[PDB]
Structure 1
Amino acid sequence: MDEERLKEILEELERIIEEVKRLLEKDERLLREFYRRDKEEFRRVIKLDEEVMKRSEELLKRAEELLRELEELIRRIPFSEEIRRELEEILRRLKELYEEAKRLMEKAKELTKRIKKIDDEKTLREWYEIVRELLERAKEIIEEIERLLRRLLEILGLE
């Protein structure tokens, strides 16, 4: 197909990662506000967190589908050996990062499930410590995905 489909896919992937970043920052803010302060207030922050997780998992499945589409079109386009190898290296790194994000979201879901089973400051602290590190790793993954998508637009000459 054309290079315009390549651009449209890369742009939709960019919009997804930007929405994912917004959602992660909202969840970080609500978790910080709770800890900087109540039992029903925790039920509240946990419910809003679980909603961010749902949206984030939907956006990931959408991004993985668009990546498969990008890989297929790049395969169909008769690129030079050098450009193909460059594009393929980047696509493999992106597949690794999307896999890392899925595993991180699984850990976050398990952690939320475990905390819902408890009444306690020490427990809430240990839990906030794990959540901070996961959110920080998530931010790192999103930033690298954003950079790699820009590299692709650049290697293709679409930026």
Structure 2
Amino acid sequence: MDEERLKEILEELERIIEEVKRLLEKDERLLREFYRRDKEEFRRVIKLDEEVMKRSEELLKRAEELLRELEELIRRIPFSEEIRRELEEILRRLKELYEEAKRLMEKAKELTKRIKKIDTEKTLREWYEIVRELLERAKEIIEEIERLLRRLLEILGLE
């Protein structure tokens, strides 16, 4: 059925967003650990950060695929006009949020690529300042996504 698949898609999207939030939190922990402290230490934290970034891009790719399938399913289901309107407002907001997240990850990837070419506290701390702000914004986007997914489940009566 379609609403069963709707339920599956939404609960999978929740799981994916919770995995991205854990990865962001693990990245913030490791970066805080490094900056409270050597060449190889910075090499390792750069590698771990890149690993977290690659994982997060995979998960965002899967979530975009799922969001497309969700939109198609909601189009096919004969919802009442009011409910269709409510769903469409949330999905519009979710697309805006996924676009903010994709731009943020692109900016983080460029910043990490640039920092990899330098050997050198101020230079690495300025890099850390930028990544701190990017991570904080990403966490906020993720939390808003969690909330809107819960809202979709409530609007549909799937709670």
Both proteins in one fold, TM over 0.5: yes
Tell me how far 1:39 sits from its aligned partner. 0.6
Which one scores higher on RCO, CA 8 angstroms, separation ≥ 6?
2
User: Structure 1 residue runs of 4+, over 3 Å off?
Assistant: none
Residue deviations 1:39-95 (CA, integer Å, cap 9, x gap): 110000000110110010000000000000010010000000000000011001101
Tell me how far 1:8 sits from its aligned partner. 0.4
Which residue does the alignment assign to 1:45?
A: 45
Q: Which runs of 5+ in 1 are unaligned?
A: none
How many residues of Structure 1 are paired with residues of Structure 2 in the alignment? Answer: 159
Residue deviations 1:78-126 (CA, integer Å, cap 9, x gap): 0000000000110011011111111100000001011111124111111
How far apart in 1 are the matches of 2:128 and 2:56? Answer: 20
Which residue does the alignment assign to 1:157?
A: 157
How far apart in 2 are the matches of 1:18 and 1:116? Answer: 29
Q: TM-score normalized by structure 2?
A: 0.98
Q: Percent identity, aligned pairs only?
A: 99
Which residue does the alignment assign to 1:10?
A: 10
Residue deviations 1:124-152 (CA, integer Å, cap 9, x gap): 11111111100000000000000000000
How far apart in 2 are the matches of 1:120 and 1:112? Answer: 14
Tell me how far 1:2 sits from its aligned partner. 2.4
How far apart in 2 are the matches of 1:42 and 1:79? Answer: 53
Which residue does the alignment assign to 1:95?
A: 95
The DSSP-based 3-state class of the residue aligned with 2:158 is: coil
The 5 Å alignment of 1:2-151 reads 2-151=2-151
